[PDB]
Design an enzyme around this catalytic site. Structure first.
Site, PDB file in Angstrom:
ATOM      1  N   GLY A 172      -8.790   8.015 -16.657  1.00 24.79           N
ATOM      2  CA  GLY A 172      -7.847   8.090 -17.533  1.00 24.79           C
ATOM      3  C   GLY A 172      -7.643   7.829 -19.327  1.00 24.79           C
ATOM      4  CD  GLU A 222      -2.014  17.040 -12.697  1.00 22.23           C
ATOM      5  OE1 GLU A 222      -2.025  16.916 -11.501  1.00 22.23           O
ATOM      6  OE2 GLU A 222      -0.877  17.491 -13.095  1.00 22.23           O
ATOM      7  CB  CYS A 227      -5.000  12.990  -6.481  1.00 16.58           C
ATOM      8  SG  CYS A 227      -6.179  13.407  -7.499  1.00 16.58           S
ATOM      9  CD  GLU A 283      -6.298   7.661  -6.062  1.00 17.41           C
ATOM     10  OE1 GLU A 283      -7.059   7.296  -6.969  1.00 17.41           O
ATOM     11  OE2 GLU A 283      -5.258   8.686  -5.808  1.00 17.41           O
TER      12      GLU A 283
END
Ligand SMILES: CCCc1c(C)c2cc3c(C)c(C)oc3cc2oc1=O
Ligand SMILES: CCCc1c(C)c2cc3c(C)c(C)oc3cc2oc1=O
Ligand SMILES: CCCc1c(C)c2cc3c(C)c(C)oc3cc2oc1=O
Ligand code: NA
Ligand code: NA
Ligand code: NA
Ligand code: NA
Lengths: 494, 494, 494, 494
Positions: free
Chosen positions: A244, A262, A296, A393
């Site tokens: 990102g 996103e 996600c 994550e």
């Protein structure tokens, strides 16, 4: 009532799509795409690079020139074409679900009944928007008539990930094409095949050449090319928070193209003691384990109130232990493989990290088969906020369960993160639902459910989970450039 | 923090208001307005009839002509004018609240803290809408540019009731004036004084002459003249359902003027057994008894789940027995007199009707004081759906308490009415709140509250409780005429 | 590209449609529908009266019950059904176009290319709205969460006229069904057959029983029964202004149902001296004569500026004289018959008044065939504002041409009417276009075009031409009932 | 009707504004601000750097905590605060206008009548939006209730330029505060004083501490600190294209804060041969010379159709020659000095460059006065597209006049630029204006006018002139974070 799959579906499309024509990369390089259930190569795919993106952008630009068929076409006719594309996808549903399962690993029943269903719904939803995104007439001071035109933003760079190959393609094409944009789309190397087949239906549906162009290749090459291109007006990226930032830096270093992202999450799923236990256990399980954990917005921090912790944990463990891991074309399978070796190994590292930092391993923890990238449903209890598995994550079938006492406490803990993509609350109490849904810093808050998406409802991140919103009316905003027209008139009257 | 009232405020304005000037009736007739607390004449007011309405409509029509100062004024400037008005009303706040109490009977503290506050908020709210109510630019097929202008509907007849004289005046003036309409306002004979003083402030705020015209008088005469007028474009009425029909028949018989109506109700207040008992008792009490029961949306069917019924009744009776009835200028007074003798007698009829048909009188049921129009707060238990006191709007301090078993049953019984203005639900349970608020056929459903109004949120009836909506953005719709303009262009491009 | 018509289409559907079944009238009575080209009976049709309306309303009310398949169905699935219905209509396009010409008289080529094109477009348009008409979340004061639901209004009575039977059916069904309403539809006795056939397609598309009901019959029986029914929530009528009054009175005399009306007009078409002459002559011809002059919005006062008058009149006459009157199934035919004997006689009546009042008959002015209801294209010059043919709606192929000098003069003359449905302006000057489009009191103003309709753009009347708007987003408003839900929360935060 | 200015107004505010308190810089350093009319120092101003930004952000963050006064405040009361701020600015209007002129050099008449007027209008417009920017209730499939909340984005960093100090401050405070954000604002070193005084009024109006914080200083220090800060959620920057890239890059390198930019322009003003010559000449003059050429949207490419070229050039030269340069406090003055020495020499540089590269110099060309920073109104003719002065933003009183033949040509040539902020068309012809306003790639297109701004109408760039929009409803978008709340309900009905 799912039709029987072809478990060895044939591949027809594996090249670059530009101007409704198939091409090799200029280098003539190809890369293998693999079946994660076997570890075997499926076929070779054209390996696009900066020069192929250059050709695609030129094709997009040409199609977006004033006077062109795409620019002159009635907005209602753009809706027709999207509805035609949906009908073609529906005609080829059995084949596409199979191909999705082969290349990505998710259970065929889920490809068919969820992904493809949601693709059709998303395309049909946005077909409806094509002639309904009105500009405004505006009561400005003085003798003038002022209004806005909502024009297309222009050439749109779309970089889509591998966890939901068809759905994401639909989430990006839907709004872009409803609003009269043109796209250069970059599909993920792990999962390019379905998007490429869909390009063949885009042609069949009758979209004019250059409106949609698809460049498979790698991220650092084809992806970075798109973000840095001087004639790309807007870029949409879905992927990691790390990547990102590259995208947004590249936008500012080049032509100040508009950016929506996103990105990742570490979404909290908060179970209050007055929740319906059976429902909450099943939904917390779904919230984490869905799509082999590769979501996600996964519920990867399950906060459970202390009075119900032990029972909740017990039921969660038992459910994780019964979760069937296996061949994704087998109707009994709930869990397919991870997408590839990199993810496979990355998830095993996180499992190892969790054991080593003193999270309690309640089940799983290991490799579930000798062939493909299968990982055992894994659950960690007594997880703490400082642990790495509570913070980063994982993107795998690894559940974290944390314990809390009070609502005021759990809010601070849930919000203490640089992520804010989603969250959830499980409770019967009206006041607690309203308090929490307000207080949570997340782009979507589910109450007594999880992973409830609808084409109508917007989705995106707070903080570093992203910027901008996809889906709904909101998903149109980033694809629209606003023009004010202000005209002098002889005498203004109300 | 309420300033001490003048209990005999002076009257300065008692005439007809047309073109920023004061006129007697052409007939020179006057009628007495009465103070309902004493039975005594306050003063005499000009009695407008057909010929005075006609003069008003002519003035209004002239102020609405194309090129006029009102029509040419910037939208933003109409908002400045609405804001200035609000400032004038705030300056004279204490006086207006005292005058409202004198003429209408409601406790001064309520006039001051509730009515006047809402008046200010309502006008300030709508001042903000004046230059924000956009039309649309529309992507029509073919070589055209299409768009909409939101024009004012024109000359608006507005017929304002006696239960909230100032606030209703504000509810109507707000959206009318913000969208650039002109108004002929008919105020209730029972309570004309405050509205007339406010006209003086309209003059002082700088509104052009003819934009707001106010004609006090009687219903059959002045009201009918406005509803039947061939040059009134729109009519707004708030009153009884019966008179509502007279208005719509008159609209259809004359010039097909547009009609919006806010009529009566028999609003159900539903108390589930898991509600907060003390809170629900105080809110059900407020819901029915506020404004001496003279609210269209009074919670006049209090449905209580059978398991909490004996207790709920026991507490509601105690609270009703303690409600202080008296001089509305006394700061300890909760309940003033009813507005006039007619209503007074109508309520006594209904009280006797209830006793006659077998409802259980739990307290009150007679006359409260020897002078004025004071009625004892009254509670009927064991009320049935078939009884007239459970069907017909009583509009006085009379509480009906019904018993129920299931949530499915209560929805059917709540909805089996020709009224549908409002409803409420008291429960801690999220699923019961959501099920009931979806199922109730009512224009407003309050959850764990009642009589919560905001300028931002619309209000209006289902069924025979009316049509169209006041407040909010929705309040502007009825004051707007939509013009579509479709222009041929050389070549349409997205 | 028009497929050859079947000039003797078989009739399949001629009964009353209720609960997806065909019924005879309770009375067993039938009425003839006539072919206006031959004067001969096509078939018998069941003659709905009050009892049949009562059955239809009951069926619709049951289909609208909470929990029913139609109420529970996903908004998006309502969209799918409409698109399905559109597909089925497209399938049977050729047939329906022929059947329309048979029963209504309009040229088959126009039935096919215009009427049925617009039907499909309308339905497809509204299919897109089904899941996009959002309510609002509202920042009310205090510790509350407030929002609005846009619910269906309920049972909708829809009385559709004979001049565009299929299209009007679409205009009304589209929004009503997109927002989840149920419908009782009264079709015209002159033109019932195409709407009955579409009922069959509604069944085949999979609409639940009761959702759409069609009752053919007469105005003073079936129509009046719907307008007065105590359980119909809403009525929409298109037709004469005079009958619109009957409707609005019926609504007030019964249950205060909501009302929208599309009534007559006497629409001014204004040609400036700088207009493109050939364009303006051809469009002005279309404006009046389209559909045998049977348009509510016909350009029936063609105001022409004095400097180009002589030439404009000469060219308009030539064009009128070349207009081919005849068999609507022959491809060279531009003008078929008027719809029935009553209209036919009424139009000849106006032609005679125009000759007697001193208007200059420039061509036509009598009957055009001995069989059926054919009338000569007729053009009157030097028409004065006070002449009957300048004031009253003729609804036939009768053109009035007035002369004017200034832009200030023509506005006043154009706006001097109790009608205000539409208007047009032809000019190359930016400021004149803007001046006139602002000043004209009409619902739609066309600039350098005429009869440009799009599903996207609202259409409706100022003054006595109607109330409410059809088409576009606006078309949903009359089919929506707004509910405010306001909930107490622990603590409101922005 | 302009009051006589105090030509040496007193400075009261020259420090850092944090938590409603005046602080020195942590370093204790200060910088001079200069009067560009005299070249002399007015006073010293606190020089904020990183450490001061860190404190401002911390105070803002605290002010934005859940449960705080600013977060708990009714949206309507935000509007009241804004309207109070406006009243204070209106009270102090004469002082502020004089102070603006002192610090920035624009004529006092313009400061009083244009800038301050527009400040008042902007704040008062956005005060209206505070309780009107609703979220949505969404008809999602399945048994769910889904809605959106429009929440504040959070801590907003606002970097405002020196060319419109007060106005730009209002453009940013308006929507930011309307929507409940808190701000850290960096004002330009050239013109800090007016924004500092306003902060004092913000305190007076009663905004809670930490809601607005103002840090004067230098760009590479204070500006960069705001763009790089890990706890700043959003950054809005107005200035040069080059510095905008640094901001985007900084946002992507830090925390993915959201970014909107208003950058440079080279806006084309296109004069067709059927334009009103005198109006066009005066508006073309205004387009370029307004605010000493210091407008991002200056009409610095004047394209003139060849048949009116010589006449228009003559008249534009004459008008430029008559332009009065001098003391801005003198009411005869049309043009004050450039803002500082850097801009001064930069403009001289461009002038010399236009002489060198073959542009025909028609008047001006040099320094008008060297006491202060005054430049002669300068007009270049026969300018070609490839010349530096035809490509690069000059930001000074220098006019480029180019010649063209066809409408198709001028579109190509006007769009051939990396800028796209504004554009204008002067013509009397409807078709030309509609063709050009659609074809021009610019954020605002003015027809027969220029520099018409209204708080109601959005403004912002295409291409590298910016991203996002200021003003109007659209100006709220960038200050809102969207939250979706999706709730499981017992049974969804329409
Ligand atoms: C057309 C509606 C008339 C009406 C109003 C305006 C009304 C206002 C308020 C306010 C403000 C509180 C606290 O209670 C009310 C009850 C109310 O009951 C009513 O019937
Ligand atoms: C309630 C309005 C009825 C009506 C329709 C539907 C109508 C449609 C069209 C179309 C389509 C073209 C080309 O012209 C029209 C004129 C029309 O005039 C009309 O009066
Ligand atoms: C980022 C926008 C800066 C800018 C503003 C705000 C601006 C305002 C006005 C007003 C007000 C008149 C009459 O002319 C202007 C020109 C202007 O040029 C500009 O470049
Ligand atoms: Na793969
Ligand atoms: Na009275
Ligand atoms: Na017929
Ligand atoms: Na300065």
């Amino acid at each position: 009532a799912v039709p029987a799959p072809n478990q060895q579906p044939e591949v027809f499309c594996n090249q670059i799509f530009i101007n409704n024509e198939w091409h090799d990369a200029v280098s003539r390089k190809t890369f293998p795409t693999v079946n994660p259930s076997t570890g075997e190569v499926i076929c070779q795919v054209a390996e696009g690079d900066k020069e192929d993106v250059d050709k695609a952008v030129k094709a997009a630009r040409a199609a977006f020139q004033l006077g062109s068929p795409w620019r002159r076409m009635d907005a209602s006719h753009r809706g027709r074409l999207l509805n035609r594309l949906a009908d073609l996808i529906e005609r080829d549903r059995t084949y596409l679900a199979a191909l999705e399962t082969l290349d990505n690993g998710k259970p065929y029943v889920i490809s068919y009944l969820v992904d493809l269903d949601m693709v059709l719904k998303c395309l049909r939803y946005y077909a409806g928007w094509a002639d309904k995104y009105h500009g405004k007439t505006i009561p400005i001071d003085g003798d003038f008539f002022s209004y806005t035109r909502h024009e297309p933003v222009g050439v749109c760079g779309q970089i889509i990930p591998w966890n939901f190959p068809l759905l994401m393609q639909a989430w990006k094409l839907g709004p872009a094409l409803a609003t009269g944009n043109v796209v250069v789309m970059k599909v993920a190397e792990q999962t390019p095949l379905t998007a490429l087949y869909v390009a063949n239906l885009i042609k069949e549906a009758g979209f004019p050449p250059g409106v949609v162009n698809i460049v498979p290749g790698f991220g650092p090459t084809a992806g970075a090319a798109i973000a840095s291109h001087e004639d790309v007006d807007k870029v949409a990226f879905t992927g990691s928070t790390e990547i990102g930032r590259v995208i947004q830096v590249a936008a500012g270093s080049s032509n100040l193209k508009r950016v929506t992202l996103e990105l990742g999450g570490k979404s909290p799923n908060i179970i209050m003691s007055d929740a319906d236990m059976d429902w909450a256990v099943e939904q917390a399980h779904f919230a984490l384990f869905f799509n082999q954990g590769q979501c996600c917005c996964a519920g990867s921090r399950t906060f459970v109130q202390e009075d119900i912790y032990d029972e909740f944990v017990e039921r969660s463990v038992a459910r994780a232990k019964s979760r069937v891991v296996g061949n994704p074309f087998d109707s009994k399978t709930e869990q397919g493989p991870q997408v590839d070796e990199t993810q496979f190994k990355k998830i095993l590292g996180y499992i190892n990290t969790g054991k080593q930092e003193g999270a309690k391993l309640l089940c799983g923890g290991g490799i579930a088969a000798d062939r493909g990238y299968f990982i055992q449903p894994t659950v960690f209890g007594d997880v703490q906020d400082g642990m790495t598995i509570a913070k980063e994550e994982i993107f795998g079938p690894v559940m974290q369960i944390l314990k809390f006492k009070t609502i005021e406490e759990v809010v601070g803990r849930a919000n203490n993160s640089t992520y804010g993509l989603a969250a959830a609350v499980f409770t019967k109490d009206l006041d607690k639902a309203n308090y929490l849904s307000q207080a949570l810093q997340a782009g979507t808050v589910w109450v007594n459910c999880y992973d409830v998406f609808g084409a109508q409802s917007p989705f995106g991140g707070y903080k570093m989970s992203g910027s901008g919103r996809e889906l709904g009316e909101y998903g149109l905003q980033a694809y629209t450039e606003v023009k004010t027209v202000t005209v002098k008139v002889p005498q203004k009257n109300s």
